[PDB]
């Protein structure tokens, strides 16, 4: 997250870190056994880390649980990033408490101008790299369809939206992928892609979770 702020420990209790001997992506806890992340984050050897603040220090309140299933959307396209969503089933259920909690799925889509909270342990620089110890947060609005298509002509599908700031300086970045975009208590987006980070006229692009609620529910029910 570039241009954000230190969340505070466990203030985003649905945020998870996906770890393969290092933090590689984010995710969102949607019930005690399932996490939503990005398809482009898929790999073998995923350990889900819940209750994290400093990802480099054991502070208390962490739960580390192996992924038992990692289910990429069958129509995920790695060239366009259409359908950039994955479900992870935990090997054992997480223990839910004030610091480890699920986030609700949307019942309807969010409109342009809706304010959201985007979070992660990704890069904090727009040029070069710096990776934080603690979780970072950014408040950002959903942009209009027209503004999103103007920024990324030919690249925005119906399963994507843009959020952030056209003036530069405030965005998600590498290492934030898979993490949450929460608006009014609902998981409306997944950190997906963008051109650079925090560059003028190049906002973040997010998977539009409301389009997938039935697919999530059906996939969880059958697994």
């Amino acid at each position: 997250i570039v241009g954000g702020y230190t969340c505070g420990a466990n203030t985003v209790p649905y945020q998870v870190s996906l770890n393969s001997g290092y933090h590689f992506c984010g995710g969102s806890l949607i019930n005690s056994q399932w996490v939503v992340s990005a398809a482009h984050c898929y790999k073998s050897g995923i350990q889900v880390r819940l209750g994290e603040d400093n990802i480099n220090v054991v502070e208390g309140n962490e739960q580390f649980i192996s992924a038992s299933k990692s289910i990429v959307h069958p129509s995920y396209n790695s060239n366009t990033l259409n359908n950039d969503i994955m479900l992870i089933k935990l090997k054992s259920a997480a223990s839910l408490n004030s610091r480890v909690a699920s986030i609700s799925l949307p019942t309807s889509c969010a409109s342009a101008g809706t304010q959201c909270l985007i979070s992660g342990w990704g890069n904090t620089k727009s040029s070069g790299t710096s990776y934080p110890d603690v979780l970072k947060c950014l408040k950002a609005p959903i942009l209009s369809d027209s503004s999103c298509k103007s920024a990324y002509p030919g690249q925005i599908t119906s399963n994507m939206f843009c959020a952030g700031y056209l003036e530069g300086g405030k965005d998600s970045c590498q290492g934030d992928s898979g993490g949450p975009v929460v608006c009014s208590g609902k998981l409306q987006g997944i950190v997906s892609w963008g051109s650079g980070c925090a560059q003028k006229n190049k906002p973040g692009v997010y998977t539009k979770v409301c389009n997938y609620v039935s697919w999530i529910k059906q996939t969880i029910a059958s697994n």
Binding site: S192, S195, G196, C197
Partner: peptide, 4 residues
């Protein structure tokens, strides 16, 4: 454009 790059994945994040």
């Amino acid at each position: 454009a790059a994945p994040r």
